[PDB]
Amino acid sequence: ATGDEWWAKCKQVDVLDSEMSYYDSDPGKHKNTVIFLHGNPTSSYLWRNVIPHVEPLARCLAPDLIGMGKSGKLPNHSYRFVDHYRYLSAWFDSVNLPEKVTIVCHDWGSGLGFHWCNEHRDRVKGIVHMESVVDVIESWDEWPDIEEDIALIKSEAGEEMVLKKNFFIERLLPSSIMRKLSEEEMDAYREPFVEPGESRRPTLTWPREIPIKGDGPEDVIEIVKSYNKWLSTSKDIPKLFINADPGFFSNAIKKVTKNWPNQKTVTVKGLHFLQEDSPEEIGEAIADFLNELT
């Protein structure tokens, strides 16, 4: 399935000064509702082979984060976590959601989805997360060895690799998928970023927001610190951690979340973009989680 076919199935809604594009399996329905949040450097297209397995049981929504996918681009090029949260939270308010929702999230979609849940604690039916942002990094030995990669990315050299060479799309993305994408699938990930320069800014700002205890950013640090604490006591929020083997962050998330209450773990084959290697198993697991809910 090509990008054209996927975004043909999506709609747009005005959000503050801009627009956001999103998949909606059942517009205007207050039945069981599941919202799928992608991260960097992907779009709603990441969920295309997962959502079919969930669609029969729930209205499925998959927004493109601001500056990503088919969503609008910000003239001032400022795409910090808080900028993404302003737009994403306004999107939540704009798609006729029922009172309680299930969030399925990945990577920075999980940072945003964890934060939105933490700020709307009475609206969360359940949370499925995978290769997620579950904590601040306080000791490097409990995380994959990215210290050097992050200092690089924060440097001007890293701006040149991302803005001019598209490092995140052309290198990081295929590096962390076990199979080989088709040309059509890769072109769908490329589509939002074909213009060199500032169109690729969201893919550079996202890794610069990594919460490193003592490297800032202190706004992200305390957002993550506060939703981690709440999730670590979230005894009556059903939670599914989908573990990717070998994964990337999965090993560290296993350790971080080991004693989180009310959390079931399922393991699938994948690296970081586990949706491209095991979409059927991931879909079936979310359906099982949904049926365990009802």
One-character DSSP codes across 181-236: PPHHHHHHHHGGG-SSSGGGHHHHHHHHT--BTTTB-HHHHHHHHHHHHHHTT-TT
Only one residue has tokens 């999230």, namely 105
Domain that holds residue 288: 1-294
Nearest-5° Cα angle at 156, 154 to 159 = 80
Tell the residue number behind the tokens 């919202």, with chain if given: 35
Cα separation, 203 vs 191, whole angstroms: 13
| Chain centre to alpha carbon of residue 224 | 15
Q: CA-to-CA distance for 68 and 106, rounded, in angstroms?
A: 15
Question: What is the Cα–Cα distance from 282 to 288, expressed in whole angstroms?
Answer: 10
- Domain count of the fold of the chain: 1
The CA distance from 239 to 158, in Å, is 36
The structure tokens 């069981």 sit at: 32
**Burial class, 73, CB count within 10 angstroms (exposed 0-12 / middle 13-18 / buried 19+):** middle
Strands 101-106 and 239-246: unpaired
Alpha carbon 111 to its chain's center = 7
Residue with tokens 């082979």: 49
Q: Which residues are catalytic?
A: 40, 107-108, 131, 272
Please calculate the CA angle 93-97-99 and round it to the nearest 5 degrees: 105
Rounded CA separation 11/8 (Å): 8
Token digits of residue 105? 């999230």
User: CA 182, CA 284: separation in Å to the nearest integer?
Assistant: 24
Task: State how far Cα 269 lies from the chain centre.
Answer: 18
Asked whether 6 and 42 are in contact (CB, 8 A), the reply is no
C-alpha distances (whole Å) from 208 to each of 57, 58, 147, 157 are: 37, 35, 12, 13
Edge-to-edge order in the sheet of strand 263-270? 10-15, 18-24, 59-63, 33-37, 101-106, 124-132, 239-246, 263-270
Single out the residue of 66, 80, 86 nearest to residue 199, CA to CA. Answer: 66
Phi, psi for 245 (deg, rounded to 5) = -120, 115
- Indicate the SS3 state at residue 15: strand
